[PDB]
């Protein structure tokens, strides 16, 4: 498994930011490094940085990085469901909450592209799609949608659809819900999904239509009408 | 038949065996019992395994009949690096 620093190969460039002005584990480049580690070492099932220093690297990130960096592991552990699913447990009960949100999405993202007769990701993320904290719910729903993109199965879709009318959920949760419903049922034009998401997008007001995440809801409709 | 279910238990490819297996069992039993029996039949650690049932988690303190199991229900067995309580404790001690 390659190292993000080695991909940057800072060991050879003239590090003109160094000495005194490099001794900080600042958020942004740490998030970049976590994403690089996820992308480059994706699907190889192993890492040297976030396996041995799994908890330790997480401890030096902050805020939305936890929801990102932990989920990064899921890309490394792609399609070895029993591989990642044995590795996310140490974070499924993490003291940290944001990294718990990242882990709960990594569980689903590991199952992306594969279908299991057991549907393990469905089982794990079913009880957290209505979690009180927005981050937990967001991670659960994103992971579950990724784990079942293109499945078109109506149990997951009927578990997902009530979140549209769930105005108590923050808007980005509704956006992710529409995105998940769209990718789970792609191009099918199924009325059960389509009418519900149409009514969901029909009710929003001016201050809601202009907000950052509403733009995804039409896509959730459009994904159901691909081609 | 006779109030017994043939649960389709799915084991990891890491333990090289038949991916889908049949386990004949009852329904009045509890979660601790199901994890223990899956462990002994397939030679796993009962405290290092988490069973997912009928698209849900095991209700460990609750009985099988209450949590929604029936005949022909799939059950994925999942290993753990620590014990199922230690899966909490290990991180719960490191701040």
**3-state helix/strand/coil string of chain A:** CCCHHHHHCCCCCCCCCCHHHHCCCCHHHHHHHHHHHHHHCCCCCCCCCCCCCHHHHHHCCCCHHHHHHHHHHHHHCCCCHHHHCCCCHHHHCCCCCHHHHHHHHHHHHHCCCCCCCCCHHHHHHHCCCCCCCHHHHHHHHHHHHHHCCCCCCHHHHHHHCHHHHCCCCCHHHHHHHHHHHHHHCCCCCCHHHHHHHHHHHHCCCHHHHCCCCCCHHHHHHHHCCCC
- Return d(Cα A193, Cα A177) in angstroms, integer: 12
**Residue in chain A lying closest to B80 (CA):** A86
Specified resolution (Å): 3.6
- Return d(Cα A35, Cα A110) in angstroms, integer: 15
Q: How was this structure determined?
A: cryo-EM
Question: Alpha carbon of B31 to those of A171, A190, B58, B63: distances in Å?
Answer: 37, 38, 6, 6
- Return d(Cα B59, Cα A157) in angstroms, integer: 24
Whether B10 and chain A come into contact, CB under 8 Å, resolves to yes
Whether B86 and chain A come into contact, CB under 8 Å, resolves to no
- Return d(Cα A176, Cα B36) in angstroms, integer: 38
Q: How far is A95 from chain B (nearest CA, A)?
A: 5
Contact call for B76 and A93, based on CB within 8 A = no
Contact call for A123 and B55, based on CB within 8 A = yes
């Amino acid at each position: 498994p390659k190292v993000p620093d080695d991909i940057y190969k800072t060991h050879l460039e003239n590090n003109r930011f160094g000495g005194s002005g490099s001794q900080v584990d600042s958020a942004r480049m740490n998030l970049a490094s976590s994403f690089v580690n996820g992308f480059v070492n994706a699907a190889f099932g192993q890492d040297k940085l976030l396996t041995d220093d799994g908890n330790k690297w997480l401890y030096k990130n902050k805020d939305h990085g936890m929801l990102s960096a932990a989920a990064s592991l899921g890309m490394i552990l792609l399609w070895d469901v029993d591989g990642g699913l044995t590795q996310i447990d140490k974070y499924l009960y993490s003291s940290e909450d944001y990294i718990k949100s990242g882990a709960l999405l990594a569980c689903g993202i590991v199952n992306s592209g594969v279908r299991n007769e057991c549907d393990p990701a469905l089982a794990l993320l079913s009880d957290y799609v209505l979690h009180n904290s927005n981050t937990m719910r967001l991670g659960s729903i994103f992971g579950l949608g990724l784990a079942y993109a293109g499945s078109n199965r109506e149990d997951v879709l009927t578990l997902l659809l009530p979140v549209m009318g769930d105005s108590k959920s923050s808007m980005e949760v509704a956006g992710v819900t529409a995105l998940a419903c769209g990718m789970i049922a792609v191009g099918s034009c199924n009325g059960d999904v389509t009418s519900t998401i149409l009514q969901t997008i029909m009710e929003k007001s001016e201050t809601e239509l202009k907000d950052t995440y509403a733009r995804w809801l039409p896509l959730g409709l459009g994904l159901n009408h691909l081609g | 038949t006779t109030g017994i279910a043939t649960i389709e238990v799915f084991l990891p490819p890491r333990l090289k065996k038949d991916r889908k297996n049949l386990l004949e069992t009852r329904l009045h039993i509890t979660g601790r019992e199901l994890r223990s029996k899956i462990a002994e039949t397939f030679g796993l650690q009962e405290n290092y395994i988490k069973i997912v049932i009928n698209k849900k988690q095991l209700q460990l303190g609750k009985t099988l009949e209450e949590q929604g199991v029936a005949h022909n229900v799939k059950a994925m067995v999942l290993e753990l690096k620590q014990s199922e309580e230690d899966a909490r404790k290990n991180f719960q001690l490191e701040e």
